[PDB]
Scaffold this active site. Structure first.
Site, PDB file in Angstrom:
ATOM      1  N   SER A  89      27.565  37.483  24.119  1.00 51.83           N
ATOM      2  CA  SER A  89      28.031  37.256  25.480  1.00 51.83           C
ATOM      3  C   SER A  89      29.020  38.267  26.052  1.00 51.83           C
ATOM      4  CB  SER A  89      28.730  35.902  25.518  1.00 51.83           C
ATOM      5  OG  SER A  89      27.924  34.892  24.945  1.00 51.83           O
ATOM      6  N   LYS A 110      34.782  29.342  29.749  1.00 54.34           N
ATOM      7  CA  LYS A 110      35.127  30.730  30.020  1.00 54.34           C
ATOM      8  C   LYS A 110      35.855  30.867  31.347  1.00 54.34           C
ATOM      9  CE  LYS A 110      31.127  32.407  27.483  1.00 54.34           C
ATOM     10  NZ  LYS A 110      29.990  33.352  27.467  1.00 54.34           N
TER      11      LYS A 110
END
Lengths: 50, 100, 89, 50
Positions: free
Chosen positions: B46, B89
Site C-alpha cells: 500500500s 489511514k
C-alpha cells in the site's frame, strides 16, 4: 499502453481472469553504441521457479 | 515487499529518464533506502507510491509540498491500483498535521 | 510474454483488445494449453474482442455454446510467426 | 483402469439411448463414437516434421 502490455488470460484457482503483462526499459540503451554486453531480464511478480 | 520495492525502483528510473534526459543521477549512484516497519504484509505494498516519489525527490533535491500524506500501490507504468483500509489511514493522518 | 517484449522492442502499439495465450518452445512452435473454457469466459467479461488460441487446441473451443462464441472472432494459430503478423498488421 | 472408465461410459450412454431413447439396438461405429464419448483427446503426432 502502446509500448509494453498485452492482455493475458489465465486460469487462476477461482475462474478465469484477465491478467496484464508489463515491462520496461531498465536503463539508458546507448551509453555505448559499440561496447557489447547482453541485456538480461529482471522478472518479478512472485514467480514460481518454472 | 522486496519485489514491490524493485518494481517501484524501475519505474522511478524509467519516469525520470523519460522526463529529464540530462539528469542521470538515479541511473548511476548507489542508494540506501529505509522503510520503517509497521504495515500488515497484505497491506504492506500500500505504501508503494511513496517510494516512487522519494527517489525522485533525491534526484531533484526539492522537498515535497509539506505535510502531504500519500499512499497507493504502483505498477510498472504508474497505474495506481486500489488499496484498502481507508478509514484508519485517514484518521491516522488527521492527527499528524496532514493537509492534503 | 513474447509479444510483450517485441512490442517494446519496436515501440509499436499492440492491436487493440486482443487477448492471447499459449506456450512457445524456443523455435516458435506453439503447444496446447488447458483451462480453455474459463479463459474465454473471462475474456468475454473484460470486453475483449479478438482472442487468439493455439491451433492444436481448436477442437475444444467449438464445444462452447453459441452465445459464448458470439462477438469473439478467434484466429487459431500454430507457429508463432502468424501471431506476430496479426498482432502488428 | 482408464480404459475401464471409457468402456463403461460408452456402454451406459448406450443404455440411456435404449431405456427411454429411440433405438432398440444401438450400433457403435468409429464415426459414431465421438458422439458418445466426446471429442478425441490425444493426437500424439510428432510436432516438427522437417
Amino acid at each position: 499502453t502502446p509500448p509494453g502490455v498485452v492482455m493475458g488470460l489465465a486460469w487462476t484457482a477461482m475462474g478465469g481472469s484477465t491478467l496484464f503483462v508489463e515491462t520496461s526499459l531498465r536503463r539508458p540503451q546507448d551509453k555505448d553504441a559499440k561496447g557489447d554486453k547482453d541485456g538480461s531480464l529482471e522478472v518479478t511478480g512472485q514467480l514460481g521457479e518454472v | 515487499m522486496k519485489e514491490s520495492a524493485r518494481i517501484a525502483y524501475t519505474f522511478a528510473r524509467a519516469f525520470l529518464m523519460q522526463h529529464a534526459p540530462a539528469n542521470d543521477y538515479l541511473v548511476t549512484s548507489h542508494i540506501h533506502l529505509h522503510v520503517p516497519e509497521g504495515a500488515t504484509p497484505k497491506d504492506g505494498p500500500s505504501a508503494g507510491c511513496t517510494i516512487v516519489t522519494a527517489l525522485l525527490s533525491l534526484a531533484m533535491g526539492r522537498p515535497v509540498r509539506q505535510n502531504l500524506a500519500m499512499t497507493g500501490e504502483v505498477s510498472l507504468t504508474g497505474k495506481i491500483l486500489p488499496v484498502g483500509g481507508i478509514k484508519e489511514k485517514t484518521i491516522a493522518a488527521k492527527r499528524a498535521g496532514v493537509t492534503c | 510474454i513474447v509479444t510483450a517484449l517485441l512490442s517494446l522492442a519496436m515501440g509499436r502499439p499492440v492491436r487493440q483488445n486482443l487477448a492471447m495465450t499459449g506456450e512457445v518452445s524456443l523455435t516458435g512452435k506453439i503447444l496446447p494449453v488447458g483451462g480453455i473454457k474459463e479463459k474465454t469466459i473471462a475474456a468475454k467479461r473484460a470486453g475483449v474482442t479478438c482472442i487468439v488460441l493455439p491451433a492444436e487446441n481448436k477442437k475444444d473451443f467449438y464445444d462452447l455454446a453459441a452465445f459464448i462464441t458470439e462477438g469473439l472472432e478467434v484466429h487459431f494459430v500454430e507457429h508463432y510467426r502468424e501471431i506476430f503478423d496479426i498482432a502488428f498488421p | 483402469r482408464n480404459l475401464q472408465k471409457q468402456v463403461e461410459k460408452v456402454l451406459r450412454k448406450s443404455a440411456y439411448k435404449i431405456v427411454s431413447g429411440e433405438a432398440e439396438s444401438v450400433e457403435v461405429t468409429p464415426e459414431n463414437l465421438q458422439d458418445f464419448v466426446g471429442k478425441p483427446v490425444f493426437t500424439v503426432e510428432r510436432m516438427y516434421d522437417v
